[PDB]
Ligand binder design. Structure first.
Ligand SMILES: CC(C)(C)Cn1c(N)nc2ccc(-c3[nH]c(C(C)(C)C)nc3-c3ccc(F)cc3)nc21
Length: 280
C-alpha cells in the first residue's frame, strides 16, 4: 500500500564541481557544478563532512533525494570521496530568518503572505509524500529569490527545538503532519515579527507548562486578527482542531490577493549558467 520510492541517487565525481567560497562551518561551500559532458554550469551548495555521523548525512541525502517540489530543497547528488559531499542548489539570499531580520524595513505584506503560501505548499507536499519534518522553523527556510523560498534542513525529517514544538511533541515525543502545523504557526509568527525569537527569555522547561495554562505567542503588531486567528488555530492542543496545510495554502492565498487588508505595515565566467530548478 506504500509505493516504492523510485527516487534516483546521483553519484558525482569530485571532478564535476568546484568549490568557490565558504558559506559556513562539517562545512558548506558556494560552488559551481558542471555535469559530466553537458555544457551547463549549475550554482550549488556543497557540504563535505569533517565519524559515524556518516549515517546522519546519508539519511538527509535519502530524504532530499526523494522530494521534488518547487518549495522543498532537492538533492542534486552525492560524492563519496574520503568524506561524504552532498551537492544541492545554491540558495543565494541565505535563510529566510536572517533575511527577514536584515531587510525588515523593506519587506512588505505581499512578500510575507506569499512566503506563508509557499511554505504551506512545501509542507503540504511533504505531507503528500507521507513525510514529517519535525523541525519546521524560519531558520530552516532558504531564499532562492525574494519571491521564492524553499523548505530545508532534512536532518530530523522522518517518513531539540522545544519552542517550536506541538504540545504532544513536548510531552510524549509524538510527531504528526499536525505536529508540523504547530511549527508552521510558530514560523509564521517569526516572519510576522520580522524575526523575533519565540518565548524570548522564557526557559524552555516552562514552555510545556505555559502552553497547558492556555497561553500562546502574542499577536504581532502588523497582524490583523484574521492573520493572527490563523496562527492561533495552528496551536490548538487538540491536534485535529489545527488547520490542514492545504487549507493554510487557501487562506493565505486569499489574503495574498489583497495583502494590505490583512497586514498593516508602515510603508507598503558565467555564460552557460543554468539554475538548478531548470536542470532536469
Ligand atoms: C546556510 C546558508 C543559507 C547560509 C548557506 N546556503 C545557501 N546560501 N544555500 C544553501 C543550500 C544548502 C545549505 C546547507 N546547509 C547545511 C547545514 C545547515 C547542514 C550546514 N547543509 C547544507 C547542504 C545540504 C545538502 C547538500 F547537498 C549541500 C548542502 N546551505 C546553503
Amino acid at each position: 500500500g506504500e509505493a516504492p520510492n523510485q527516487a534516483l541517487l546521483r553519484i558525482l565525481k569530485e571532478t564535476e564541481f568546484k568549490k568557490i567560497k565558504v558559506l559556513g562551518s562539517g562545512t558548506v561551500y558556494k560552488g559551481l557544478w558542471i555535469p559530466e559532458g553537458e555544457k551547463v554550469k549549475i550554482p550549488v551548495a556543497i557540504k563535505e563532512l569533517r565519524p559515524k555521523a556518516n549515517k546522519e548525512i546519508l539519511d538527509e541525502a535519502y530524504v532530499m533525494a526523494s522530494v521534488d517540489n518547487p518549495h522543498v530543497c532537492r538533492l542534486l547528488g552525492i560524492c563519496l570521496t574520503s568524506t561524504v559531499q552532498l551537492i544541492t542548489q545554491l540558495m543565494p539570499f541565505g535563510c529566510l530568518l536572517d533575511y527577514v531580520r536584515e531587510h525588515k524595513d523593506n519587506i512588505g505584506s505581499q512578500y510575507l503572505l506569499n512566503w506563508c503560501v509557499q511554505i504551506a505548499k512545501g509542507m503540504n507536499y511533504l505531507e503528500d509524500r507521507r513525510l514529517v519534518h519535525r523541525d519546521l522553523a524560519a531558520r530552516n527556510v532558504l531564499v532562492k529569490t525574494p519571491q521564492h523560498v524553499k523548505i530545508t534542513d532534512f536532518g530530523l525529517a522522518k517518513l531539540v527545538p522545544i519552542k517550536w514544538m506541538a504540545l504532544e511533541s513536548i510531552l510524549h515525543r509524538i510527531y504528526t503532519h499536525q505536529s508540523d502545523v504547530w511549527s508552521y504557526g510558530v514560523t509564521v509568527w517569526e516572519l510576522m515579527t520580522f524575526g523575533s525569537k519565540p518565548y524570548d527569555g522564557i526557559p524552555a522547561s516552562e514552555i510545556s507548562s505555559i502552553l497547558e495554562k492556555g497561553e500562546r505567542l502574542p499577536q504581532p503588531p502588523i497582524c490583523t486578527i484574521d492573520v493572527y486567528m490563523i496562527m492561533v488555530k495552528c496551536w490548538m492542543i487538540d491536534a485535529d482542531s489545527r488547520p490542514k496545510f492545504r487549507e493554510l495554502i487557501i487562506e493565505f492565498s486569499k489574503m495574498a490577493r489583497d495583502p494590505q487588508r490583512y497586514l498593516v505595515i508602515q510603508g507598503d565566467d558565467m555564460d552557460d549558467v543554468v539554475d538548478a530548478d531548470e536542470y532536469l
